[PDB]
Symmetry: D2
Subunit: 114 residues, 4 copies
């Protein structure tokens, strides 16, 4: 139900081996670890969760952009990119969180389909 | 060797049934039709060309964004989105031209892989 | 030293009356409230801080995009856009945090200048 | 009535000395040169046209992104960014064409205001 895709706007490539952490907002308003991984050779991270586990609520996707750029020998601006959203059962069932990275800028979009 | 992908930033969806025209720059500097189609249900347009036909040169991808938005009952700013680039044999072999559409804005990126 | 500018990609206009909250990471690793304000009719937010107050640190600029879109009667995807960065670690700089908003997508860019 | 502003997403800075060519579609469907200029040290290009001259029509703003990146010694993907739009068809408006550049990607947004 949840896929994360990361692209590199400098090189025109997938952003490979980027660490991604997903958190779910707990009742006390803290962020609890939910799932994590590293993007693949295609810049994608599949298998984070299942339909049963991905219940409605507020989630945060943190993308470790700073490590990515530093490994390329580039100093970037942001500490990470964060994407915070509510999962809603009314809407379509599959969420792709896409991010497009540059050293001083990033874009993110949600593609939500059935 | 060439794929075009179009997303809708307003609805968080693929942009479906968007007309896309590809042109190749001729020796006289005019744009000659090269390939065309409409994006699919996944917002993608596959099968535009073959490796044999997609020789080095300058290409233009014109995306009919204005018709897309008008069919959704929205008045948009741009007449179309245009992506102009050189195909280069030195670089990786597969080109994805991605576009992210809003009524008054668009983003485009090239993902070039082997 | 810190300015925030927000545009609306749907309207082709400044994004007006967007709430922005800035935090700074404290010694204990918590996010301490640092400054807040709203974008004006030009989509800009000036006056958040001073050169003296804007010391080195890790800052988070929270742009309340959901509140913006809901005040316009639109159901958007994100809760907010968060921009997190180290500032002033090589001496004072001027930071513009720009954001471009759509209901299911946003962009942010930093322009950093040395006075 | 027409301003162009360009940022560099790699540097986190204005994109300086970017060449911009504006065309207007003629009666015969050709692109007629309309105005041109370069972005300043602030990444802005002012003074392209006048209220009188900027009549209704279909305009193309060509931002010479390859020339910009090649002047910096970088091999980018696109030849240029083209922004094509109908202007002034409900009376005079003020247009800002903004662009954010990276070597393999760009964004453009229009801010349209009624004076």
């Amino acid at each position: 139900p949840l896929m994360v895709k990361v692209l590199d706007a400098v090189r025109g490539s997938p952003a490979i081996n980027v660490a991604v952490h997903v958190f779910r907002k707990a009742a006390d308003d803290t962020w609890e670890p939910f799932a994590s991984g590293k993007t693949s050779e295609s810049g994608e991270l599949h298998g984070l969760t299942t339909e049963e586990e991905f219940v409605e609520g507020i989630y945060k996707v943190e993308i470790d952009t700073k490590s990515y750029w530093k490994a390329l020998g580039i100093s970037p601006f942001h500490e990470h990119a964060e994407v915070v959203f509510t999962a809603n059962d009314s809407g379509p069932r599959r969420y792709t969180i896409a991010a497009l990275l540059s050293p001083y800028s990033y874009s993110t979009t949600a593609v939500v389909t059935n």
